[PDB]
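Sequence of DNA (cytosine-5)-methyltransferase 1 (Homo sapiens).
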Amino acid sequence: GPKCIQCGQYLDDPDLKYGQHPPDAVDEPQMLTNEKLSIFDALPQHKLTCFSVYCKHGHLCPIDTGLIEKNIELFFSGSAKPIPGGVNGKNLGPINEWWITGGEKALIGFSTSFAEYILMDPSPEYAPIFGLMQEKIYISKIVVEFLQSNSDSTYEDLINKIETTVPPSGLNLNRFTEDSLLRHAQFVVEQVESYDEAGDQPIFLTPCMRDLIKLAGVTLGQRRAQA
Ligand SMILES: OC[C@H]1O[C@@H](O)[C@H](O)[C@@H](O)[C@@H]1O
Ligand code: NA
Ligand SMILES: [Zn+2]
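Predicted 3D structure, token representation.
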């Protein structure tokens, strides 16, 4: 059958899910405007709950399969609060970047051109897709996040950060060991390099990255041997 030219999902797939929003849901521009008036009565981050992520045609999509980085537009919806009653938003974005943020729990966050959103609970329709978050891309975000904030980090510091990071339960991920990192060494170093080559001291040069780059060149078993 025919595919969506945005996300590649089959239109006639019985598992295909569309985004839903309550009738009073508004635009990101509408939401941010209303908000300006409320603080008049500056630019904080938002909590976003009962959230969904989708392509421009409304197909529910993964955050982490490369769509964003390929410059395919991902839109999102949910109930937003600036930062424990929210405002219903729909077709927010697109997402320019997703990232990790923190009590030792690493939460998914989105940047649009206008605002930042910390993701709380998925909508029940989105939950199984959010649940398919991969270990390697989440680990990558943790790595990138940890090295931005700690430019002098050693490999031991990194493994510690990884081992103690609890994924939120919506991600449906096991706790991480040193093996979680080692098994994805190559993917991780590609992600760190990609981050460095994209914007603006590079995290690729951090002492612990030197170690990871080297471990990326050895068989998985031999990486483990060095654990
Ligand atoms: O750690 C959280 C921060 O990560 C950065 O990479 C993003 O640009 C910010 O939007 C975010 O607040
Ligand atoms: Na998962
Ligand atoms: Zn689509």
